[PDB]
Amino acid sequence: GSMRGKVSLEEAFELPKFAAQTKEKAELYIAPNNRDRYFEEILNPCGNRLELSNKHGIGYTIYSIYSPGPQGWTERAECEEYARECNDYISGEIANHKDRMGAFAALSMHDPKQASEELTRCVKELGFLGALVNDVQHAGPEGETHIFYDQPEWDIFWQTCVDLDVPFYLHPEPPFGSYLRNQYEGRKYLIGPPVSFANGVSLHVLGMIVNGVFDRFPKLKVILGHLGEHIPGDFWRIEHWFEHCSRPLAKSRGDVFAEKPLLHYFRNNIWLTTSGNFSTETLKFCVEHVGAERILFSVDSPYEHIDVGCGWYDDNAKAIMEAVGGEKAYKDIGRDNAKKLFKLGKFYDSE
């Protein structure tokens, strides 16, 4: 039996006044027959995508800025203003649907203190449930500076996430600059879900792990989409290499390295979602490694179709239950894991 009240939390929007920027994303990610729907959905949080969510048994949608969003704005002052405008916009949109909509903060990640202050404003003044940031922050007068969040200056930001007790969703973004030119110009259809997205996110979150972010902040919560961005299939190989090479080599140099086994972080600090990965077999493999309580349903609208993602979870209920360990596990992944993680009250169809 399928369920209603599902929680979906990798659902993107853009500011309506930047509709022209969304045509550029459409040329990277949207087939011609899907263009009309994409443009309507990405610019209207309360439009047809809400009607489809109601029809297909979603109880609570958490909205976030699309990609790269602020992470593609290389001038700090403009970036900070854009992020604020995104947060004020989506706060106004979700205001009329409090029983079935929430939001993640959009952030400028040029400066850790400023990002901490905007996250605090979103959570404590606007009721947002976390942050969603599109991989590395690009910067400089030519856009080549790549700002990663696994370096020590970001500790003030991680402390803010822990103080607010909200998660950080690390979302992918397309290649930029020389990386785009050198490695993707001759294979442009690999920009996005086929490989480039997960290549970047996996690099970044493994960076957080090996640079000790979760050792310094054991209560930090991070979310990865797409069933973990290539990492679960490599759980054995990565941990093996850390044991065989990386940990003793770093120790011999006095270099910082992760204190715990790889799977510790994926069983304590990291949650996965099913965004764009409507795969019962891949879901099963992930459940077997991280536990059914650590995986959250999500669609990845508007790049994926709500009816398709919900159709997978709903229409294959019996097979998915068998794969993930029974009825409670199935309802946990669909709804109750996220209900507990985000401390959601009663919401639309939640019981």
Next chain:
Amino acid sequence: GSMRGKVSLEEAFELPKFAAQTKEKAELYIAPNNRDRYFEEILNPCGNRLELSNKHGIGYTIYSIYSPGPQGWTERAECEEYARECNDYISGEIANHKDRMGAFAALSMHDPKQASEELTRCVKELGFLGALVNDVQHAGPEGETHIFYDQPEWDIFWQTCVDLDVPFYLHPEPPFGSYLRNQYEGRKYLIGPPVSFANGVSLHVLGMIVNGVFDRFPKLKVILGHLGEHIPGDFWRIEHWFEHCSRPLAKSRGDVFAEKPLLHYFRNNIWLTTSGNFSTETLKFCVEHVGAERILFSVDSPYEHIDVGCGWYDDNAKAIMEAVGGEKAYKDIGRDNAKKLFKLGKFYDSEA
């Protein structure tokens, strides 16, 4: 239920006269307690690594140049000379152990025709079994030029692979240039097996797929190590995206795109090895998608330890057999898949 006669084919060496270059690789990939063993193995194809292979039930080792090898030599003329010297060296070393050693060609990949000629020389004159190339060929200052083999000029090379009927093993290599600086300087321990290696190989082989290489050369054979370099866990997502976005978008523009589903290529053109991935659970997942006949045992010596890789496969024989679908599947992965793919005749312990 363990077996002897296993075939292992991601086994690297370096030219003895470049022993000093192996110090740089040791600083990236080798823990201090393993340095003495690494240096002995990487420079001695017939040394202790052969004694370990005999002890641990390997029947046939296919040697290849380590990484980046020629792919890091940015000057074409020097690169071509180095690749030739590698091939002549290893041909001489394996000559004294023909029942249990073979080799893959090292190639300069600056020029498709020149690489085709050196592969032909290795196969037809030296008896080599295929080519092993460490991802993109670097050129230019600091290696900033990335030469990919999924562009149309490379069809002359793929036609040669098909003419010779030998496989192409696409192995990883470290980051170079601005990519190394921008994306790895603050997380240097992720260079290598933790993520950077598979990030590059998966991009490159998916590039071959989406640029139609296997549609134009349906008989081409490609090998990937490390149980497929992140791709199997994403089989569903990649094919879904090709159906939902990439294929109709490319078709609307008249752009080349893969004609068949992703799994067709992984069931017809591509084989996986277990190099550096002694994981029964990951092996099971791969078998369930591509078939036990398309996965080959391998160790990835000297970066991995022969006793460890063979120990996994041998000591867990019963559990692995159950995971991969029985005794024939287990012996296929250990030995007989590679025996048939490389047309190996009788070899050491080959009927064990």
